Design an enzyme around this catalytic site. Structure first.
Site, short mmCIF file in Angstrom:
data_model
loop_
_atom_site.label_atom_id
_atom_site.label_comp_id
_atom_site.label_asym_id
_atom_site.label_seq_id
_atom_site.Cartn_x
_atom_site.Cartn_y
_atom_site.Cartn_z
N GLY B 9 -28.74 52.20 7.00
CA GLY B 9 -29.63 51.52 7.89
C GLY B 9 -30.97 52.22 8.00
O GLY B 9 -31.20 53.25 7.37
N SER B 36 -19.40 44.94 4.30
CA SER B 36 -20.66 44.67 5.03
C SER B 36 -21.77 44.00 4.23
O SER B 36 -22.38 44.62 3.35
CB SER B 36 -21.18 45.96 5.66
OG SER B 36 -22.48 45.79 6.20
N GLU B 37 -22.07 42.74 4.55
CA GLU B 37 -23.11 42.00 3.85
C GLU B 37 -24.51 42.67 4.04
O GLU B 37 -25.35 42.60 3.14
CB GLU B 37 -23.10 40.50 4.24
CG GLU B 37 -23.98 39.56 3.40
CD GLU B 37 -23.54 39.31 1.95
OE1 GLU B 37 -22.35 39.53 1.59
OE2 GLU B 37 -24.41 38.88 1.15
N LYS B 38 -24.71 43.33 5.18
CA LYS B 38 -25.92 44.15 5.43
C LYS B 38 -26.10 45.30 4.38
O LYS B 38 -27.12 45.37 3.68
CB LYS B 38 -25.90 44.72 6.87
CG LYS B 38 -27.21 44.51 7.63
CD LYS B 38 -27.06 44.74 9.13
CE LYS B 38 -26.86 46.21 9.49
NZ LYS B 38 -28.05 47.07 9.17
N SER B 39 -25.10 46.16 4.32
CA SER B 39 -24.94 47.16 3.23
C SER B 39 -25.14 46.67 1.80
O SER B 39 -25.66 47.43 1.00
CB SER B 39 -23.58 47.84 3.29
OG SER B 39 -23.69 48.99 4.04
N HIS B 215 -25.74 52.66 30.24
CA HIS B 215 -25.25 51.43 29.58
C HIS B 215 -23.95 50.86 30.14
O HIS B 215 -23.77 49.62 30.23
CB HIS B 215 -25.11 51.64 28.05
CG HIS B 215 -26.41 51.65 27.32
ND1 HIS B 215 -26.48 51.58 25.94
CD2 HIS B 215 -27.69 51.68 27.76
CE1 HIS B 215 -27.76 51.60 25.57
NE2 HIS B 215 -28.51 51.64 26.66
#
Ligand SMILES: [N+]
Ligand SMILES: [N+]
EC number: 1.5.1.52
Lengths: 4, 428, 428, 4
Positions: B9, B36-39, B215
């Site tokens: 990332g 992971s399609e991002k990867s 958070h």
């Protein structure tokens, strides 16, 4: 720009 | 002088450029195309250009910019082979164990230093205890947080990233006091014009992250959980006051309670307490001198409970707008609190994901809960946070039986991580 | 059955229509053309049409509407002659004495009842003590506030007014317990569908006005006094948080302090205390159930100081918007707190006026200060409010020596009023 | 409409  | 960088990332890329420019390491990076399609888009983009690029927005940060190539981009963790002196973990804290456990024995035996860039409270313990089977003297370093804000402008060119902000202060601790690696990192921070406070232990550094304390109350309440899991009739906002957002006296009390349970845990490890207000106001987002008394900020930790809450509420109200922005001709400032909740969403393979908020806070809070049990400290506020999140997950499964759902909706996750913390605390 | 109505503004007209429709009195009204271009336009308009008119906006209030004529409109106070059973004071409280003192001895000897529509704390005392020289058994009635909101749409037709709102609850007391006039007023309120709580004394009723406690902190602070007297680089707003407006922890503390000084004064007169929060929230402007705990509202008066302040701050923040308005498609509600400060301004004869806020609060607070001295109660918060206002007035005179200024800029005003309260408190 |  905004609060993170 | 080989470095293995876990993650592809924006954070990984920024850090990789720093290593490329400022260190002698040969850099290998590792993604996870296998899950992971991002990867996979990152791998495909890097394969095509043979370059990563960091841009900046503010020329104050020139020294972070650059175009670079690395030695090797691995497509998946299991492909990693050979020996690496240093492992940098630029993934999310919940994947540290699951990722290291996929590396080979040969790789794991070679490692001298694991550097954790965005750990939670408990991460060093997990990682030290794990790596101990393979190494007698593994050095583990935790930072408080990543150094700034980096993103991808364009999803289709995810090898080109933009660092928009750099934090004012960062903390860092090592399992090894004043080690060579600590001093090198300190000299590097100086070169990068980033202030770095070296603290006594990784755990000390892990606790200087405002998100740990904030958070969970902000995201693990009925108002927020509805907005993320079910949706709303009109847009609502994370930082606004009820009914525009979740902030309420009730929410502020839940935050104080959670903070104190955490302060009890920290007294056990003999780590200094965290002045949550001072942190918010002097290190994160400033307010006007008229809004909060300097004595109240300084002495926050010893002020009466109701007064601590009042000051927290007041803080949040003071950043409804950016009071340091230029007001327009009607006296209106920038709407700094208009941050929408990210909702549950289908990935490109139609699998429902829970967004980072509160996915990742479930892990953080689950680990805090588990430390707590092992130390015999009560955490009723923490427990309730987790119960709410589990309810919302179960309610989603019951309500969306025709939908394919990610492993994030399961119980009880993090068994390996929990076992390692248990083991680490039996031994000390 | 003659009634003298002092005032020709919207309030006077609404009240005059009620008397016209619902009572047997012949109604005379009195303005002040001798000192007011507003009064002269009203007189000129009435002379022309020979009619006043009340319109309504919400048909809920039908019974208040109407066209009417009165018996006689007097042009100035000094013109008043003859005998009147009942005097209604629909002017501002600071003019009660100055106005009655201009009536003839014959008029003053005839009066049985003086009804004060918008008195401050101390008004009945001033008026009872004054009227005592002329009458042995004058009955004085105080309301908490005027019954609603009435205005003029068009400055050029000031005999036509519009009642836009009616209050939920009003209070009333008389110098004469359960008098005929109290019962008549009670029956009238019933006819008008307005709830009216009869309380033990006029002073009791005068204290059920939220403005007494709230306007002084809101308007008599450095932020507000600058906005009214000097102006600002960008518009600022009465009800907004710093820097958009004055509301600050500091301001909320000044309000609590002022409220407590007032509660000490009230304990002296054996008048019940005022739950300022309950009043704000149940009688004025409601908030969402989630914003404030019902126990905190109920028990406000006995809660710790810091908690009383937190709850007041929280209240003000909750009405930054109207939380009961319809949110638009971006989740934004009506900007209920965007009320500008009225600045000092030149009348049509070029005389600088100070607006009602804080002109009229200077009088109220000056009277509270004077009661306080006479009772030996300390009022350091009150004192400071007055000091600030006096400073701003003096600073304006020094800064605007080429400008003609109204008597509002002078010291020390209200000597007659003060003497009468002094006398009334020696006697009881 | 506004705060009064
Ligand atoms: N926050
Ligand atoms: N107010």
């Amino acid at each position: 720009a905004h609060h993170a | 002088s080989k470095l293995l960088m876990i993650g592809t990332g924006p954070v990984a890329i920024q850090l990789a450029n720093i290593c490329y420019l400022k260190s002698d390491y040969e850099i290998d990076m590792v993604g996870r195309a296998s899950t992971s399609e991002k990867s996979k888009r990152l791998y495909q983009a890097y394969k095509k250009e043979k370059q990563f690029e960091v841009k900046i927005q503010n020329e104050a940060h020139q020294h972070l910019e650059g175009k670079f190539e690395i030695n090797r981009l691995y497509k998946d963790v299991k492909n990693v082979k050979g020996e690496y002196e240093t492992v940098v973990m630029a993934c999310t804290a919940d994947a540290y164990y699951d990722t290291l456990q996929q590396l080979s024995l040969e790789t794991l035996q070679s490692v001298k230093h694991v550097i954790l860039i965005s750990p939670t409270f408990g991460s060093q313990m997990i990682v030290e205890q794990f790596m101990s089977k393979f190494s007698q003297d593994i050095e583990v370093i935790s930072f408080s947080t990543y150094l700034g804000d980096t993103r991808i402008v364009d999803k289709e060119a995810p090898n080109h990233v933009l660092t928009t902000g750099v934090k004012k202060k960062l903390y860092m601790g090592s399992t090894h006091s004043n080690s060579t690696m600590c001093q090198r990192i300190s000299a590097l921070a100086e070169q990068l014009k980033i202030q770095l406070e070296v603290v006594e232990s990784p755990l000390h550094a892990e606790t200087r992250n405002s998100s740990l304390y904030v958070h969970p109350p902000l995201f693990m309440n009925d108002f927020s959980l509805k907005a993320i899991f079910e949706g709303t009739d009109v847009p609502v906002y994370v930082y606004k006051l009820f009914p525009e957002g979740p902030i309420t006296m009730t929410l502020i009390r839940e935050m104080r309670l959670m903070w104190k349970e955490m302060m009890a845990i920290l007294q056990a490890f003999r780590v200094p307490s965290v002045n949550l207000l001072q942190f918010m106001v002097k290190e994160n987002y400033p307010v006007r001198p008229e809004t909060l008394d300097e004595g109240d900020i300084e002495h926050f930790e010893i002020l009466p409970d109701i007064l601590q809450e009042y000051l927290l509420y007041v803080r949040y109200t003071a950043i409804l707008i950016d009071p340091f922005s230029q007001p327009d001709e009607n006296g209106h400032y920038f709407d700094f609190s208009a941050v929408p909740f990210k909702q549950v969403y289908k990935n490109e393979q139609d699998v429902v994901q829970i967004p980072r908020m509160p996915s990742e806070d479930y892990y953080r809070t689950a680990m805090i809960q588990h430390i707590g049990k092992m130390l015999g400290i009560k955490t009723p506020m923490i427990d309730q946070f987790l119960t709410r999140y589990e309810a919302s997950c179960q309610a989603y499964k019951d309500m969306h039986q025709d939908q394919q759902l990610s492993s994030q909706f399961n119980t009880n996750l993090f068994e390996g991580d929990k076992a390692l913390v248990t083991k680490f605390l039996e031994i000390n």
